[PDB]
Amino acid sequence: MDFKQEVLDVLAEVCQDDIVKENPDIEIFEEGLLDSFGTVELLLAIENRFDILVPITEFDRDVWNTPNNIVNQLSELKR
Amino acid sequence: MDFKQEVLDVLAEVCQDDIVKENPDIEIFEEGLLDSFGTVELLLAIENRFDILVPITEFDRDVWNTPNNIVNQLSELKRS
Amino acid sequence: MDFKQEVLDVLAEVCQDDIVKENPDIEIFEEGLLDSFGTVELLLAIENRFDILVPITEFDRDVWNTPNNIVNQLSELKR
Amino acid sequence: MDFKQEVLDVLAEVCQDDIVKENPDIEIFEEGLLDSFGTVELLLAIENRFDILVPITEFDRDVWNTPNNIVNQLSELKRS
C-alpha cells in the first residue's frame, strides 16, 4: 500500500480538488480548500478507513495544516 | 451574552423541562430527560445558535452527561 | 394550552427572533429568518414536542411560508 | 455532470468497495457494506458535495437500501 497516497486520496476526495494531491505542502485551511464540515467528514473518514480516532478537540488547523503534516500527525497518533 | 445561561436555555427548550437549567449538574441522560432524537435536535440548535459543529459520532452520554459538562465540552470545542 | 403559541414559541426559538412571534403572517423564508439547518431543527422539534412526524420531502416552503400557515399545515396533519 | 454516477462514486468511497457502484441495486446495509458510522460520513459528504441536507433522524435503512434508491431519495429531497 501507500499510506501517504491513501491519506492524500481521502484528502482529495473530501476537498473535491486534486490540488491537495499535487501539492502535499499546500496550506489546506489557508487556501479555503477544507471547511468545518469537510474537517468533520475527514476525521470520520480517518476513523472509518484507518481505525484512527482523532477527537475534534485534538485536531488543530495549525498543526494539521498540510497534507504532509496531516500524514505526519496521523502516523504519530498510531504510535 | 452569558454563554452558559444560553446553553442552559437551549437544554431546557429541547428537554422541555426547566429542571435542567435549574439543576446544572443533573444527569440529563440518566434521568431520561433526553433521548437520541432530542440529542440530534440539541446538536442542530448548538450549530445554529453558537456556530459550533458537534459530530453526532463524537457525542458521548458519559462525557456530555450534565448541562455544566455540556457547557464545558462546548467551550473546549470552540478553542484551539 | 395554546397550540398556536406553542408553535409560535418554538418558531421564535429556532429563528432566534421574536419577530415571527409578533408577526404571525410574516414570510419566514422570504425574510431569511429560517434557513435549511433551522428548518431541519424545526421539524425535529415538532416531532419531539408534538409527536407529529413531518417528512422533509413533505415540507414545502411555499405552503409552510408563515407561522399561521405552518400552524395550519400541522393541524391538518394530525387530522 | 452525472448526478447518479457522482452518488455512486461517493458510496464507493465511504463503503471502500467498488461493488456498490458496479451493482446499483445491491442491498448496501443487508450486505453489511455500511454501518452507522459510515452512514454519518455519507450524509456529511452528501451535504458537502451536493448541498443536500439529510437529517440523520430521517435516514431509513429500509428506504435508503440501495445506491439507486439512495439516488432517488436524494432526487426527491432536492425538489419541491
Side-chain angles (χ1 to χ4, degrees), chain A, chain B residues 1-79, chain C, chain D residues 1-79:
Chain A
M1 77 162 65
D2 189 350
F3 180 72
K4 181 184 183 179
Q5 276 297 147
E6 271 272 28
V7 179
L8 295 185
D9 288 341
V10 174
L11 222 37
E13 297 169 355
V14 182
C15 293
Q16 313 185 226
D17 204 319
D18 293 353
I19 191 175
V20 304
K21 201 161 51 175
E22 296 149 351
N23 297 257
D25 297 308
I26 192 175
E27 304 278 350
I28 308 176
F29 297 97
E30 293 292 336
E31 213 76 10
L33 297 163
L34 198 52
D35 63 16
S36 285
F37 283 98
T39 291
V40 169
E41 178 190 352
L42 203 208
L43 298 183
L44 194 46
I46 285 168
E47 163 64 30
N48 288 332
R49 304 179 195 178
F50 307 117
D51 195 11
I52 305 173
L53 179 53
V54 182
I56 173 65
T57 52
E58 296 187 13
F59 185 85
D60 191 342
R61 291 190 171 192
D62 274 33
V63 187
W64 305 60
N65 61 324
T66 74
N68 272 343
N69 286 347
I70 290 165
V71 168
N72 183 42
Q73 289 299 318
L74 282 173
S75 179
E76 296 190 345
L77 267 168
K78 282 182 173 179
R79 308 141 66 195
Chain B
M1 210 262 83
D2 186 11
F3 180 66
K4 176 181 179 177
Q5 191 57 43
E6 295 178 344
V7 170
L8 299 186
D9 285 351
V10 177
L11 284 173
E13 294 172 0
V14 179
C15 288
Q16 287 290 285
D17 199 325
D18 285 345
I19 193 175
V20 302
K21 63 178 182 184
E22 298 163 341
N23 298 260
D25 300 299
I26 202 177
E27 299 280 357
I28 297 174
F29 297 101
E30 287 298 328
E31 296 272 2
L33 283 161
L34 202 56
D35 58 7
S36 43
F37 270 63
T39 296
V40 170
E41 184 187 342
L42 174 69
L43 299 191
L44 279 168
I46 289 167
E47 172 180 357
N48 293 345
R49 303 177 201 185
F50 311 116
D51 282 36
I52 301 165
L53 185 57
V54 180
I56 176 68
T57 49
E58 278 211 42
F59 189 85
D60 181 339
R61 290 191 177 193
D62 295 347
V63 175
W64 303 62
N65 57 326
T66 77
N68 269 161
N69 282 341
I70 286 178
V71 170
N72 289 333
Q73 284 302 322
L74 295 179
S75 294
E76 311 264 27
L77 282 166
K78 201 160 185 177
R79 305 187 195 98
Chain C
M1 77 162 65
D2 189 350
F3 180 72
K4 181 184 183 179
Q5 276 297 147
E6 271 272 28
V7 179
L8 295 185
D9 288 341
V10 174
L11 222 37
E13 297 169 355
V14 182
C15 293
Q16 313 185 226
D17 204 319
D18 293 353
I19 191 175
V20 304
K21 201 161 51 175
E22 296 149 351
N23 297 257
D25 297 308
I26 192 175
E27 304 278 350
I28 308 176
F29 297 97
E30 293 292 336
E31 213 76 10
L33 297 163
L34 198 52
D35 63 16
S36 285
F37 283 98
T39 291
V40 169
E41 178 190 352
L42 203 208
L43 298 183
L44 194 46
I46 285 168
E47 163 64 30
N48 288 332
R49 304 179 195 178
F50 307 117
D51 195 11
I52 305 173
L53 179 53
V54 182
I56 173 65
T57 52
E58 296 187 13
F59 185 85
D60 191 342
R61 291 190 171 192
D62 274 33
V63 187
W64 305 60
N65 61 324
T66 74
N68 272 343
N69 286 347
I70 290 165
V71 168
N72 183 42
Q73 289 299 318
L74 282 173
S75 179
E76 296 190 345
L77 267 168
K78 282 182 173 179
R79 308 141 66 195
Chain D
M1 210 262 83
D2 186 11
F3 180 66
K4 176 181 179 177
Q5 191 57 43
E6 295 178 344
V7 170
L8 299 186
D9 285 351
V10 177
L11 284 173
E13 294 172 0
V14 179
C15 288
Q16 287 290 285
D17 199 325
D18 285 345
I19 193 175
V20 302
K21 63 178 182 184
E22 298 163 341
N23 298 260
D25 300 299
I26 202 177
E27 299 280 357
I28 297 174
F29 297 101
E30 287 298 328
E31 296 272 2
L33 283 161
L34 202 56
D35 58 7
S36 43
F37 270 63
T39 296
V40 170
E41 184 187 342
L42 174 69
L43 299 191
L44 279 168
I46 289 167
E47 172 180 357
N48 293 345
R49 303 177 201 185
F50 311 116
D51 282 36
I52 301 165
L53 185 57
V54 180
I56 176 68
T57 49
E58 278 211 42
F59 189 85
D60 181 339
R61 290 191 177 193
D62 295 347
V63 175
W64 303 62
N65 57 326
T66 77
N68 269 161
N69 282 341
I70 286 178
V71 170
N72 289 333
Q73 284 302 322
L74 295 179
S75 294
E76 311 264 27
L77 282 166
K78 201 160 185 177
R79 305 187 195 98

